[PDB]
Copies of this chain bind each other. A is one copy, B any other.
């Protein structure tokens, strides 16, 4: 049902693009800006970022609470957009590490942890600081 609605959207976007028309989904610009910000972040802050990624190794036994503890330090005295990009890059690095160590199954678990931590901690800050649209225009 959600699956069948995504198939429809995908097909119609493809067909409209093929005929010279762009049917932009609401989050397209946000997803692009965040891919670009994460790339720039990992290129600018390699050493500092390695100090953050060194704080957590996820195994099949790991509970959300261990992830939440490390991310709570990142946001202990508040949220900013740079720390949100760090959060996304951190989750990326944990997924790459998981696949390196033949624990592919943990990628969907880490994804669910990130979505949980966004819902609980970051989305309420986002809504009072301009939304994802502000993040898009700040990254330029």
Which A positions have Cβ atoms within 8 angstroms of B?
Answer: 1, 3-12, 14-16, 18-19, 21, 23, 26-27, 30-31, 34-35, 38-39, 88-89, 91-93, 95-96, 99, 107, 110-111, 114-115, 118-119, 123, 132
Contacts and interface: CB of A to CB of B under 8 A. Distances in A.
Residue from A11, A23, A39, A91 whose CB has the most chain B CB atoms within 10 Å:
A11
Nearest to A113: B8
Contacts of A39: 18
The secondary structure that dominates the A interface is helix
Contact of A111 (B9, B89, B96): B9
Given A21-B99, A95-B16, A11 B35 contact: yes
25 contacts: A1-B115, A1-B119, A3-B26, A4-B119, A5-B111, A6-B31, A7-B34, A7-B118, A8-B88, A8-B91, A8-B111, A8-B114, A10-B31, A10-B34, A11-B34, A11-B88, A12-B114, A14-B35, A14-B38, A15-B93, A16-B92, A16-B95, A19-B96, A21-B99, A23-B95
A98 B10 CA distance: 17
Nearest to A2: B2
A107 B15 contact: no
B8 A118 contact: yes
Contacts of A21: 96, 99
